[PDB]
């Protein structure tokens, strides 16, 4: 019969600050009757206790009557006490992901919400939860009260509640390896793969173990139906999915009309293959006010239409099985978009997703795939505790040629080539040594800082030359225009000498798509060529050719 | 039976708060190894569980040293360290032994376990908080706290500095010329002997430290060699092509920022005029005289280049290809205090990130031996890639600071 206590957790207010000193709000006659009634039973139970005039601390108190519901409930306002309490280790950061669960033959739910108050508070802190109950017509002193348990709405109540619930369950979960118990607020989820008879048997051992500390649970009835709804998901005995994602059939799409459809499509994207949100996010990436009817690009209409074909036929994801291997497949969608499906068995996806390129000036496919892969590796470690084996759209030879020559250290975990629709590849490859028999083009460009007038040209070893005038340009643009002129007038194999550190940087990164049409034109030219050798020489010193063109492009 | 009856008073830096660094995801095998390790440290009372009133947190993970395949627990105390009162012992901080880098042979010893025999200051134990993560946020994280001196902390070596001194007198009084230095959980022993009588002399210091109440069986052997700063050389050919001279002028034009006396006028003259890149250009009288004068300037040392203890060290690393890497250490641009070329080794020649990570570790070690402190690195890899793999190949008990360079250096070869 003797129940053992629940160790108290020493608490403290922020260093240098004091307790709260807020005034009480003048309540109406009816309300006061409610509060007095409430505070009466609560004092009986143990929840609170009356205090003398010593306690200088006071916290506002209200009472609200839930519309179309009998009786009321007090609501203490700890807004101020919270801003003066220390910090706690919030272990309530993020929840599990369905796809990481493993099916169970039986699964029960216990409601431990009733034990949120059976958890004592720190003695030397109770004096901070003081509050006053104004009396009728204020012709008497209001009744004072202080808490002896975890207040509903205090900063560290959840934190203290969870830590204590754990310590108690610890011994049990240790001596019952055949059962699993997830803890999350007012609900305890227990499950196990065994006889439906023996399951409800061990459930009682739990209910009874919780008894040894006093904690009691409301056990009776049966809330069974596969349509388990939890944190936005829809769990079933052996599959899951997102709650019905309804695509607003509206005509006038304001800011929140799309922005609330962005966060909503991203949610659905963890299981429906193909969702796209690029053309949509690019419509409110920089808009004014919270809402505003903004016209949708023609591109944000053809994908949103492919959303109603993907979001047409409900799709379901399975559950994780430790024994089978874990595979990951990636696909290239375009405009810097990629999709991935993770699974163990063909067509039985555990989950799915997308990757968006990082906003940059230049970029290439291989760099993006790596980024997408590192992102899937980290997500899998989080959900399954291990790195999946990859199936990618890139030949083994293409990868080796790349890593061995990239100026950076790079790496991809174990993987295999999959011959699907498109194929990531290298568009062009620069030589390491000059080409014998190829014409040599000495290029140069330059602009006037004020007039914005520049020239871009070149001279070769065969006597060919050219200089073109430009208006409204910088030095950087002129140096690129010059590389381009050479690439257009040269044959299949060519040697190019420049003094532009700026140009060399753009090209040694080996981009295959860019924001600047000038860089894109260069790419197109590099692709048609068979061998291009790009060499650099210091500026404003006698290198010649670069020194001769440099003169023609100046003044 | 070594255990101080008292503890040394420790506090954080004037007006600074404890660490609150987030713990990153770990693989399921690493989780099981940390659970086993921590289950035993708790019984040995080295650590203890803590409640939620503790908001402080420091990262933590699992590696494996050189020999032993058994898991080891490494705690990242970087944040805690810079916030920790730079211990200013009343007896000063051992003036770094400038004799360590001149010694022909140095050996590194892991006397980490000697720290766990000394209690930590009660009012600080809450700053060493760390969590053992759980897969899929299924269960709440196991939380702990250190009771002894934590390996990886910048204070553990200093606090233990007093006991360490006398544990070494019966050896330091015997062998005068031997130089001993300490950093973190490492002990560095240099000498001028030979591998025969150097390797055995270490076994002597091993049993000796074993009789004073003390992974206590590892050691790494290294030899600080020639050229603190490698010279810069110019090709020596008999026939030059326009391309060859074009790269020469580029290299000299770069060296000149280092050595002001270099001249490239007479060499640029051969270049005036648009000529094919693979054509041979005869050197002129003046050309060869200048190439001769420049070659001499490069033989001599750089202008007065000194080390400033107040400022911090920078470390650049270039990827040369085929398992080769180059590097330089410095405080001021164009005033290297050290340059080198870490070559191929166990990188399987297929893993770029494993090599880089071994290079970083190797350059750090050397750095501790010359100036007694680690350098700030500028790694040639995307931040994302590095943060995803580094830990799978790390083996040192300390961790340096680092940043990422995203612009391809124009000099990927003048350092070759
Ligand atoms: C059996 O597969 C499961 C299914 C299908 C559903 C759930 C439920 C929530 C999942 C979130 C809790 C969690 N996180 N990690 C873990 C671990 O569990 C859930 C939810 C509600 C509202 C329920 O109302 C009910 O009456 N039941 C029975 C409910 C069950 C758990 C599992 C398990 O495997 S756990 C034992």
mmCIF file of N, CA, C and O and ligand atoms in Angstrom, chain A residues 95-98 100-110 179-184 187-193 199 222-231 233-240 319, chain B residues 136-139, ligand 1:
data_model
loop_
_atom_site.group_PDB
_atom_site.id
_atom_site.type_symbol
_atom_site.label_atom_id
_atom_site.label_comp_id
_atom_site.label_asym_id
_atom_site.label_seq_id
_atom_site.Cartn_x
_atom_site.Cartn_y
_atom_site.Cartn_z
ATOM 1 N N UNK A 95 9.689 14.658 -33.511
ATOM 2 C CA UNK A 95 9.087 13.353 -33.260
ATOM 3 C C UNK A 95 9.579 12.297 -34.260
ATOM 4 O O UNK A 95 10.258 12.624 -35.229
ATOM 5 N N UNK A 96 9.262 11.012 -34.014
ATOM 6 C CA UNK A 96 9.652 9.899 -34.881
ATOM 7 C C UNK A 96 9.061 10.080 -36.269
ATOM 8 O O UNK A 96 8.252 10.981 -36.495
ATOM 9 N N UNK A 97 9.477 9.237 -37.206
ATOM 10 C CA UNK A 97 8.925 9.299 -38.546
ATOM 11 C C UNK A 97 8.345 7.929 -38.800
ATOM 12 O O UNK A 97 9.053 6.927 -38.737
ATOM 13 N N UNK A 98 7.046 7.864 -39.105
ATOM 14 C CA UNK A 98 6.362 6.596 -39.369
ATOM 15 C C UNK A 98 7.246 5.561 -40.052
ATOM 16 O O UNK A 98 7.379 4.428 -39.591
ATOM 17 N N UNK A 100 10.077 4.876 -39.936
ATOM 18 C CA UNK A 100 11.120 4.279 -39.126
ATOM 19 C C UNK A 100 10.572 3.275 -38.127
ATOM 20 O O UNK A 100 11.324 2.561 -37.450
ATOM 21 N N UNK A 101 9.251 3.217 -38.012
ATOM 22 C CA UNK A 101 8.648 2.274 -37.085
ATOM 23 C C UNK A 101 8.691 0.879 -37.692
ATOM 24 O O UNK A 101 8.948 0.707 -38.889
ATOM 25 N N UNK A 102 8.472 -0.117 -36.852
ATOM 26 C CA UNK A 102 8.437 -1.493 -37.309
ATOM 27 C C UNK A 102 7.079 -2.005 -36.837
ATOM 28 O O UNK A 102 6.704 -1.805 -35.678
ATOM 29 N N UNK A 103 6.329 -2.621 -37.750
ATOM 30 C CA UNK A 103 4.994 -3.132 -37.437
ATOM 31 C C UNK A 103 4.957 -3.984 -36.198
ATOM 32 O O UNK A 103 5.952 -4.589 -35.803
ATOM 33 N N UNK A 104 3.789 -4.022 -35.582
ATOM 34 C CA UNK A 104 3.595 -4.816 -34.390
ATOM 35 C C UNK A 104 2.249 -5.543 -34.497
ATOM 36 O O UNK A 104 1.297 -5.009 -35.071
ATOM 37 N N UNK A 105 2.189 -6.773 -33.989
ATOM 38 C CA UNK A 105 0.947 -7.541 -34.025
ATOM 39 C C UNK A 105 -0.101 -6.884 -33.132
ATOM 40 O O UNK A 105 -1.295 -6.955 -33.425
ATOM 41 N N UNK A 106 0.342 -6.234 -32.056
ATOM 42 C CA UNK A 106 -0.582 -5.580 -31.130
ATOM 43 C C UNK A 106 -0.058 -4.221 -30.621
ATOM 44 O O UNK A 106 1.121 -4.082 -30.284
ATOM 45 N N UNK A 107 -0.947 -3.231 -30.547
ATOM 46 C CA UNK A 107 -0.572 -1.898 -30.089
ATOM 47 C C UNK A 107 -1.622 -1.182 -29.253
ATOM 48 O O UNK A 107 -2.690 -0.846 -29.755
ATOM 49 N N UNK A 108 -1.294 -0.913 -27.992
ATOM 50 C CA UNK A 108 -2.217 -0.247 -27.070
ATOM 51 C C UNK A 108 -1.795 1.168 -26.717
ATOM 52 O O UNK A 108 -0.634 1.522 -26.847
ATOM 53 N N UNK A 109 -2.737 1.966 -26.236
ATOM 54 C CA UNK A 109 -2.438 3.330 -25.839
ATOM 55 C C UNK A 109 -2.906 3.565 -24.409
ATOM 56 O O UNK A 109 -4.060 3.295 -24.084
ATOM 57 N N UNK A 110 -2.010 4.046 -23.550
ATOM 58 C CA UNK A 110 -2.368 4.353 -22.167
ATOM 59 C C UNK A 110 -2.417 5.864 -22.046
ATOM 60 O O UNK A 110 -1.658 6.570 -22.706
ATOM 61 N N UNK A 179 8.760 -5.970 -25.454
ATOM 62 C CA UNK A 179 7.775 -4.910 -25.660
ATOM 63 C C UNK A 179 8.478 -3.564 -25.848
ATOM 64 O O UNK A 179 9.600 -3.372 -25.378
ATOM 65 N N UNK A 180 7.812 -2.634 -26.524
ATOM 66 C CA UNK A 180 8.385 -1.321 -26.795
ATOM 67 C C UNK A 180 7.449 -0.226 -26.310
ATOM 68 O O UNK A 180 6.238 -0.330 -26.478
ATOM 69 N N UNK A 181 7.997 0.833 -25.720
ATOM 70 C CA UNK A 181 7.159 1.914 -25.203
ATOM 71 C C UNK A 181 7.566 3.314 -25.608
ATOM 72 O O UNK A 181 8.548 3.823 -25.098
ATOM 73 N N UNK A 182 6.811 3.953 -26.491
ATOM 74 C CA UNK A 182 7.139 5.321 -26.878
ATOM 75 C C UNK A 182 6.426 6.272 -25.916
ATOM 76 O O UNK A 182 5.276 6.052 -25.555
ATOM 77 N N UNK A 183 7.110 7.329 -25.503
ATOM 78 C CA UNK A 183 6.528 8.303 -24.594
ATOM 79 C C UNK A 183 6.385 9.649 -25.287
ATOM 80 O O UNK A 183 7.338 10.138 -25.895
ATOM 81 N N UNK A 184 5.199 10.251 -25.201
ATOM 82 C CA UNK A 184 4.968 11.553 -25.832
ATOM 83 C C UNK A 184 3.785 12.306 -25.249
ATOM 84 O O UNK A 184 2.667 12.206 -25.751
ATOM 85 N N UNK A 187 0.197 10.611 -23.515
ATOM 86 C CA UNK A 187 -0.042 9.271 -24.022
ATOM 87 C C UNK A 187 1.205 8.406 -24.005
ATOM 88 O O UNK A 187 2.299 8.852 -24.346
ATOM 89 N N UNK A 188 1.025 7.160 -23.592
ATOM 90 C CA UNK A 188 2.101 6.190 -23.569
ATOM 91 C C UNK A 188 1.720 5.183 -24.639
ATOM 92 O O UNK A 188 0.613 4.656 -24.623
ATOM 93 N N UNK A 189 2.613 4.929 -25.586
ATOM 94 C CA UNK A 189 2.303 3.963 -26.618
ATOM 95 C C UNK A 189 3.108 2.694 -26.379
ATOM 96 O O UNK A 189 4.344 2.715 -26.392
ATOM 97 N N UNK A 190 2.407 1.596 -26.112
ATOM 98 C CA UNK A 190 3.081 0.324 -25.905
ATOM 99 C C UNK A 190 2.686 -0.573 -27.051
ATOM 100 O O UNK A 190 1.589 -0.454 -27.574
ATOM 101 N N UNK A 191 3.575 -1.472 -27.442
ATOM 102 C CA UNK A 191 3.265 -2.375 -28.535
ATOM 103 C C UNK A 191 4.127 -3.607 -28.412
ATOM 104 O O UNK A 191 5.042 -3.625 -27.594
ATOM 105 N N UNK A 192 3.838 -4.641 -29.198
ATOM 106 C CA UNK A 192 4.634 -5.864 -29.162
ATOM 107 C C UNK A 192 4.069 -6.905 -30.117
ATOM 108 O O UNK A 192 2.865 -6.928 -30.392
ATOM 109 N N UNK A 193 4.952 -7.764 -30.623
ATOM 110 C CA UNK A 193 4.565 -8.808 -31.557
ATOM 111 C C UNK A 193 4.402 -10.144 -30.855
ATOM 112 O O UNK A 193 5.289 -10.995 -30.914
ATOM 113 N N UNK A 199 -0.337 -10.094 -24.506
ATOM 114 C CA UNK A 199 -0.120 -8.653 -24.639
ATOM 115 C C UNK A 199 -0.897 -7.913 -23.564
ATOM 116 O O UNK A 199 -0.324 -7.156 -22.789
ATOM 117 N N UNK A 222 -12.650 0.572 -25.504
ATOM 118 C CA UNK A 222 -11.758 0.158 -26.584
ATOM 119 C C UNK A 222 -11.944 1.115 -27.768
ATOM 120 O O UNK A 222 -13.012 1.165 -28.377
ATOM 121 N N UNK A 223 -10.899 1.877 -28.080
ATOM 122 C CA UNK A 223 -10.924 2.869 -29.161
ATOM 123 C C UNK A 223 -10.279 2.363 -30.457
ATOM 124 O O UNK A 223 -9.544 3.075 -31.141
ATOM 125 N N UNK A 224 -10.602 1.133 -30.824
ATOM 126 C CA UNK A 224 -9.995 0.531 -32.002
ATOM 127 C C UNK A 224 -10.640 0.754 -33.340
ATOM 128 O O UNK A 224 -11.805 0.469 -33.460
ATOM 129 N N UNK A 225 -9.864 1.188 -34.320
ATOM 130 C CA UNK A 225 -10.224 1.374 -35.729
ATOM 131 C C UNK A 225 -8.917 1.768 -36.420
ATOM 132 O O UNK A 225 -8.208 2.651 -35.942
ATOM 133 N N UNK A 226 -8.589 1.113 -37.529
ATOM 134 C CA UNK A 226 -7.294 1.314 -38.200
ATOM 135 C C UNK A 226 -6.913 2.777 -38.470
ATOM 136 O O UNK A 226 -5.728 3.093 -38.570
ATOM 137 N N UNK A 227 -7.911 3.645 -38.590
ATOM 138 C CA UNK A 227 -7.716 5.059 -38.946
ATOM 139 C C UNK A 227 -7.083 5.903 -37.828
ATOM 140 O O UNK A 227 -7.600 6.962 -37.472
ATOM 141 N N UNK A 228 -5.967 5.418 -37.296
ATOM 142 C CA UNK A 228 -5.157 6.098 -36.291
ATOM 143 C C UNK A 228 -4.590 7.409 -36.825
ATOM 144 O O UNK A 228 -3.788 7.415 -37.758
ATOM 145 N N UNK A 229 -5.010 8.517 -36.224
ATOM 146 C CA UNK A 229 -4.529 9.838 -36.621
ATOM 147 C C UNK A 229 -3.542 10.365 -35.580
ATOM 148 O O UNK A 229 -3.858 10.478 -34.394
ATOM 149 N N UNK A 230 -2.337 10.693 -36.030
ATOM 150 C CA UNK A 230 -1.303 11.186 -35.128
ATOM 151 C C UNK A 230 -0.418 12.218 -35.844
ATOM 152 O O UNK A 230 0.015 12.001 -36.975
ATOM 153 N N UNK A 231 -0.175 13.343 -35.184
ATOM 154 C CA UNK A 231 0.655 14.404 -35.740
ATOM 155 C C UNK A 231 0.680 14.503 -37.259
ATOM 156 O O UNK A 231 1.731 14.340 -37.871
ATOM 157 N N UNK A 233 -0.232 12.511 -39.550
ATOM 158 C CA UNK A 233 -0.147 11.264 -40.291
ATOM 159 C C UNK A 233 -1.435 10.459 -40.155
ATOM 160 O O UNK A 233 -2.375 10.873 -39.470
ATOM 161 N N UNK A 234 -1.463 9.313 -40.830
ATOM 162 C CA UNK A 234 -2.589 8.384 -40.808
ATOM 163 C C UNK A 234 -2.010 6.986 -40.726
ATOM 164 O O UNK A 234 -1.796 6.328 -41.745
ATOM 165 N N UNK A 235 -1.771 6.523 -39.510
ATOM 166 C CA UNK A 235 -1.183 5.210 -39.309
ATOM 167 C C UNK A 235 -2.185 4.076 -39.415
ATOM 168 O O UNK A 235 -3.336 4.198 -39.004
ATOM 169 N N UNK A 236 -1.729 2.969 -39.984
ATOM 170 C CA UNK A 236 -2.554 1.783 -40.153
ATOM 171 C C UNK A 236 -1.751 0.630 -39.600
ATOM 172 O O UNK A 236 -0.593 0.803 -39.251
ATOM 173 N N UNK A 237 -2.352 -0.563 -39.507
ATOM 174 C CA UNK A 237 -1.673 -1.753 -38.982
ATOM 175 C C UNK A 237 -0.361 -2.102 -39.680
ATOM 176 O O UNK A 237 0.534 -2.709 -39.085
ATOM 177 N N UNK A 238 -0.251 -1.703 -40.943
ATOM 178 C CA UNK A 238 0.931 -2.030 -41.722
ATOM 179 C C UNK A 238 1.218 -1.062 -42.895
ATOM 180 O O UNK A 238 1.699 -1.468 -43.954
ATOM 181 N N UNK A 239 0.925 0.216 -42.705
ATOM 182 C CA UNK A 239 1.168 1.217 -43.740
ATOM 183 C C UNK A 239 0.813 2.581 -43.169
ATOM 184 O O UNK A 239 0.136 2.670 -42.146
ATOM 185 N N UNK A 240 1.273 3.645 -43.814
ATOM 186 C CA UNK A 240 0.980 4.993 -43.336
ATOM 187 C C UNK A 240 0.835 5.953 -44.507
ATOM 188 O O UNK A 240 0.981 5.559 -45.655
ATOM 189 N N UNK A 319 6.527 0.061 -43.616
ATOM 190 C CA UNK A 319 7.266 0.156 -42.370
ATOM 191 C C UNK A 319 8.610 -0.518 -42.527
ATOM 192 O O UNK A 319 8.773 -1.461 -43.312
ATOM 193 N N UNK B 136 15.890 7.693 -34.368
ATOM 194 C CA UNK B 136 14.567 8.212 -34.701
ATOM 195 C C UNK B 136 13.835 8.932 -33.569
ATOM 196 O O UNK B 136 12.615 8.906 -33.508
ATOM 197 N N UNK B 137 14.556 9.578 -32.671
ATOM 198 C CA UNK B 137 13.880 10.272 -31.572
ATOM 199 C C UNK B 137 12.876 9.382 -30.843
ATOM 200 O O UNK B 137 11.953 9.887 -30.194
ATOM 201 N N UNK B 138 13.049 8.068 -30.945
ATOM 202 C CA UNK B 138 12.148 7.122 -30.291
ATOM 203 C C UNK B 138 12.104 7.284 -28.790
ATOM 204 O O UNK B 138 11.037 7.339 -28.182
ATOM 205 N N UNK B 139 13.281 7.327 -28.198
ATOM 206 C CA UNK B 139 13.408 7.459 -26.762
ATOM 207 C C UNK B 139 14.078 8.793 -26.443
ATOM 208 O O UNK B 139 14.705 9.401 -27.311
HETATM 209 C C1 LIG C 1 1.956 -0.564 -34.501
HETATM 210 O O1 LIG C 1 2.525 0.561 -35.169
HETATM 211 C C2 LIG C 1 2.037 1.703 -34.614
HETATM 212 C C3 LIG C 1 0.905 2.307 -35.142
HETATM 213 C C4 LIG C 1 0.188 1.678 -36.339
HETATM 214 C C5 LIG C 1 0.433 3.495 -34.596
HETATM 215 C C6 LIG C 1 1.099 4.091 -33.524
HETATM 216 C C7 LIG C 1 0.653 5.297 -33.021
HETATM 217 C C8 LIG C 1 1.461 6.429 -33.054
HETATM 218 C C9 LIG C 1 2.769 6.521 -33.523
HETATM 219 C C10 LIG C 1 3.552 7.594 -32.768
HETATM 220 C C11 LIG C 1 4.084 7.039 -31.448
HETATM 221 C C12 LIG C 1 5.411 6.315 -31.656
HETATM 222 N N1 LIG C 1 6.577 6.862 -32.030
HETATM 223 N N2 LIG C 1 7.467 6.008 -32.014
HETATM 224 C C13 LIG C 1 6.940 4.851 -31.629
HETATM 225 C C14 LIG C 1 7.760 3.551 -31.453
HETATM 226 O O2 LIG C 1 5.618 4.996 -31.396
HETATM 227 C C15 LIG C 1 -0.653 5.402 -32.527
HETATM 228 C C16 LIG C 1 -1.285 6.636 -32.458
HETATM 229 C C17 LIG C 1 -2.585 6.721 -31.959
HETATM 230 C C18 LIG C 1 -3.283 8.084 -31.867
HETATM 231 C C19 LIG C 1 -3.238 5.580 -31.538
HETATM 232 O O3 LIG C 1 -4.496 5.369 -31.022
HETATM 233 C C20 LIG C 1 -4.588 4.026 -30.794
HETATM 234 O O4 LIG C 1 -5.568 3.446 -30.324
HETATM 235 N N3 LIG C 1 -3.456 3.429 -31.146
HETATM 236 C C21 LIG C 1 -3.185 1.979 -31.045
HETATM 237 C C22 LIG C 1 -2.603 4.346 -31.608
HETATM 238 C C23 LIG C 1 -1.309 4.255 -32.100
HETATM 239 C C24 LIG C 1 2.227 3.472 -32.989
HETATM 240 C C25 LIG C 1 2.696 2.282 -33.530
HETATM 241 C C26 LIG C 1 3.912 1.571 -32.926
HETATM 242 O O5 LIG C 1 4.479 0.666 -33.529
HETATM 243 S S1 LIG C 1 4.522 2.067 -31.359
HETATM 244 C C27 LIG C 1 4.234 0.749 -30.200
#
